[PDB]
Design an enzyme around this catalytic site. Structure first.
Site, PDB file in Angstrom:
ATOM      1  N   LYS A  62      20.950  71.399  48.253  1.00  0.00           N
ATOM      2  CA  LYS A  62      22.090  71.246  47.365  1.00  0.00           C
ATOM      3  C   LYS A  62      21.678  70.590  46.074  1.00  0.00           C
ATOM      4  O   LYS A  62      22.253  70.890  45.025  1.00  0.00           O
ATOM      5  CB  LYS A  62      23.218  70.457  48.037  1.00  0.00           C
ATOM      6  CG  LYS A  62      23.710  71.140  49.317  1.00  0.00           C
ATOM      7  CD  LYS A  62      24.787  70.334  50.048  1.00  0.00           C
ATOM      8  CE  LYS A  62      25.149  70.981  51.378  1.00  0.00           C
ATOM      9  NZ  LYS A  62      25.724  72.284  51.114  1.00  0.00           N
ATOM     10  N   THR A  91      44.745  61.505  52.422  1.00  0.00           N
ATOM     11  CA  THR A  91      44.033  60.394  53.073  1.00  0.00           C
ATOM     12  C   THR A  91      43.773  59.205  52.152  1.00  0.00           C
ATOM     13  O   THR A  91      43.410  58.149  52.613  1.00  0.00           O
ATOM     14  CB  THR A  91      42.675  60.833  53.677  1.00  0.00           C
ATOM     15  OG1 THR A  91      41.763  61.230  52.656  1.00  0.00           O
ATOM     16  CG2 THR A  91      42.854  61.984  54.636  1.00  0.00           C
ATOM     17  N   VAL A  93      46.080  57.580  51.005  1.00  0.00           N
ATOM     18  CA  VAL A  93      47.127  56.652  51.459  1.00  0.00           C
ATOM     19  C   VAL A  93      46.642  55.880  52.689  1.00  0.00           C
ATOM     20  O   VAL A  93      46.239  56.482  53.687  1.00  0.00           O
ATOM     21  CB  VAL A  93      48.428  57.346  51.830  1.00  0.00           C
ATOM     22  CG1 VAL A  93      49.480  56.308  52.308  1.00  0.00           C
ATOM     23  CG2 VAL A  93      48.995  58.096  50.619  1.00  0.00           C
ATOM     24  N   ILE A  96      47.108  56.965  56.393  1.00  0.00           N
ATOM     25  CA  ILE A  96      47.068  58.435  56.569  1.00  0.00           C
ATOM     26  C   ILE A  96      45.598  58.821  56.711  1.00  0.00           C
ATOM     27  O   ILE A  96      44.841  58.778  55.749  1.00  0.00           O
ATOM     28  CB  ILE A  96      47.702  59.232  55.410  1.00  0.00           C
ATOM     29  CG1 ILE A  96      49.168  58.862  55.215  1.00  0.00           C
ATOM     30  CG2 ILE A  96      47.577  60.801  55.655  1.00  0.00           C
ATOM     31  CD1 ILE A  96      49.914  59.758  54.260  1.00  0.00           C
ATOM     32  N   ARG A 139      40.423  47.568  41.981  1.00  0.00           N
ATOM     33  CA  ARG A 139      39.498  46.515  42.363  1.00  0.00           C
ATOM     34  C   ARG A 139      40.085  45.196  41.930  1.00  0.00           C
ATOM     35  O   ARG A 139      41.013  45.154  41.129  1.00  0.00           O
ATOM     36  CB  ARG A 139      38.103  46.752  41.752  1.00  0.00           C
ATOM     37  CG  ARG A 139      37.428  47.964  42.383  1.00  0.00           C
ATOM     38  CD  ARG A 139      35.954  47.916  42.221  1.00  0.00           C
ATOM     39  NE  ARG A 139      35.350  46.775  42.889  1.00  0.00           N
ATOM     40  CZ  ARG A 139      34.970  46.749  44.160  1.00  0.00           C
ATOM     41  NH1 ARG A 139      35.160  47.803  44.933  1.00  0.00           N
ATOM     42  NH2 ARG A 139      34.412  45.653  44.663  1.00  0.00           N
ATOM     43  N   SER A 170      31.464  40.829  49.840  1.00  0.00           N
ATOM     44  CA  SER A 170      30.570  40.767  48.691  1.00  0.00           C
ATOM     45  C   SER A 170      30.970  39.594  47.784  1.00  0.00           C
ATOM     46  O   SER A 170      30.130  39.035  47.053  1.00  0.00           O
ATOM     47  CB  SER A 170      30.622  42.081  47.909  1.00  0.00           C
ATOM     48  OG  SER A 170      31.952  42.330  47.459  1.00  0.00           O
ATOM     49  N   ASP A 180      38.982  44.093  48.454  1.00  0.00           N
ATOM     50  CA  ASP A 180      40.037  43.429  49.203  1.00  0.00           C
ATOM     51  C   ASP A 180      39.590  41.997  49.505  1.00  0.00           C
ATOM     52  O   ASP A 180      38.522  41.569  49.059  1.00  0.00           O
ATOM     53  CB  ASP A 180      40.367  44.189  50.496  1.00  0.00           C
ATOM     54  CG  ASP A 180      39.169  44.332  51.438  1.00  0.00           C
ATOM     55  OD1 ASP A 180      38.123  43.721  51.207  1.00  0.00           O
ATOM     56  OD2 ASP A 180      39.289  45.070  52.428  1.00  0.00           O
ATOM     57  N   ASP A 182      38.776  39.395  52.665  1.00  0.00           N
ATOM     58  CA  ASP A 182      38.442  39.336  54.090  1.00  0.00           C
ATOM     59  C   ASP A 182      38.266  37.871  54.472  1.00  0.00           C
ATOM     60  O   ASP A 182      37.299  37.234  54.024  1.00  0.00           O
ATOM     61  CB  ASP A 182      37.153  40.122  54.362  1.00  0.00           C
ATOM     62  CG  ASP A 182      36.924  40.417  55.848  1.00  0.00           C
ATOM     63  OD1 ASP A 182      37.841  40.211  56.668  1.00  0.00           O
ATOM     64  OD2 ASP A 182      35.813  40.888  56.196  1.00  0.00           O
TER      65      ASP A 182
HETATM   66 NA    NA Z   1      43.941  56.852  54.524  1.00  0.00          NA
END
Ligand code: NA
Ligand code: NA
Ligand code: NA
Length: 320
Positions: A62, A91, A93, A96, A139, A170, A180, A182
């Site tokens: 490829k 996806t 979402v 989902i 972010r 991180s 996010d 954590d």
């Molecule tokens: Na999702």
DNA sequence: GTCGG
DNA sequence: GCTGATGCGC
DNA sequence: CCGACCGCGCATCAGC
């Protein structure tokens, strides 16, 4: 230097995860994209790339096609397929996944607007994911991570001073931004030997309007949504996880969830070299037959480095 | 899809 | 109602 | 040539 290639590979990864439901191919493509992203030369051929670990025969082909033509026909096909592109989009979402997204698309639900019309067909997690669709894809600048940390550490402190809280990811390694937050939580009263401990912390963060929504919550894990206090621009909503971990396993958890994943790889490798096995929970000695013995006492991250005679590595030096 | 046993 | 499987995100 | 590729906590469903 190889932005086009790594973009191609990431696109392929997303297609395998979301449409093909082939999670190992998804990760194979990601692995390839990572190793190429880090390559300090402009790739000139498939054969060149194939020298890299994670890049095999099919990906080399490829890369040749991409280099000659500036595109992949496989990807153009996929992008022009309405079903595939809608499944892939849905996806994004939170809540989902590939199965829900295919089901939705099968019955003509293909856009955010379609989801909004059919909210009765979503579960709670999904409704939240839809509600904050844009915010969740943003972010989080480090300066906000720091304000969020201070809130969490303070409110935990207010419930009980013996709580220990650590913001990992991180972020703890000095990242200039995060995806996010954590949070790893422990308390002297919680050990692997032997009660609303997490709840009290979640409840207090709700009390002060820091936590705004819950995706899921049980005795040891909370996943939700939070927002910094705002007559000016209101902050985006953010994803926060909080994990309650036994104190005797706490610093192994901190170690693990600080990463990087590559750092953890090299450290577990090195631990083995010296007769120990480290996982998320414990560090254990290996007998000569390779039988793990009892978990060793750990009172800090440093303890783990000591056991394997590794020089302590500052979190920001844990890139790999 | 790529790898290693 | 109960148990175990699955989906999902991490 | 063939199986591994992390695997767990929680929400929800499938099967009873
Ligand atoms: Na999702
Ligand atoms: Na290779
Ligand atoms: Na393997």
């Amino acid at each position: 230097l190889n932005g086009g290639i790594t973009d191609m590979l990431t696109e392929l990864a997303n297609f395998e995860k979301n449409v093909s439901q082939a999670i190992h191919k998804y990760n194979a493509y990601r692995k390839a994209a990572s190793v190429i992203a880090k390559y300090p030369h402009k790739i000139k051929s498939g054969a060149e790339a194939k020298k890299l670990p994670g890049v095999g025969t099919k990906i080399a082909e490829k890369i040749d096609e991409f280099l000659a033509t500036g595109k992949l026909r496989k990807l153009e096909k996929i992008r022009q397929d309405d079903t595939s592109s809608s499944i892939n989009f849905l996806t994004r979402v939170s809540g989902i996944g590939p199965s829900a997204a295919r089901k939705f698309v099968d019955e003509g639900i293909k856009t955010l607007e379609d989801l909004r019309k059919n909210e009765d067909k979503l579960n709670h997690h999904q409704r939240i994911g839809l509600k904050y669709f844009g915010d969740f894809e943003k972010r989080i600048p480090r300066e906000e991570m720091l304000q969020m940390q201070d809130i969490v550490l303070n409110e935990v402190k207010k419930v009980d001073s013996e709580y220990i809280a650590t913001v990992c990811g991180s972020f703890r390694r000095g990242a200039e931004s995060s995806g996010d937050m954590d949070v790893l939580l422990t308390h002297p009263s919680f050990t692997s030997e032997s009660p609303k401990l997490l709840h009290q912390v979640v409840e207090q963060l709700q009390k002060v309007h820091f936590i705004t929504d819950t995706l899921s919550k049980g005795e040891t894990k909370f996943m939700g949504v939070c927002q910094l206090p705002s007559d000016e621009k209101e902050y985006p909503h953010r994803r926060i996880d909080i994990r309650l971990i036994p104190k005797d396993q706490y610093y192994c958890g901190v170690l693990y969830f600080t990463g990087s994943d590559i750092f953890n790889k090299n450290m577990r490798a090195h631990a083995l070299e010296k007769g120990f096995t480290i996982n998320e929970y414990t560090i254990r000695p290996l007998g000569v037959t390779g039988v793990a013995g009892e978990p060793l006492p750990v009172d800090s991250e440093k303890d783990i480095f000591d056991y394997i005679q590794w020089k302590y590595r500052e979190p920001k030096d844990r890139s790999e």
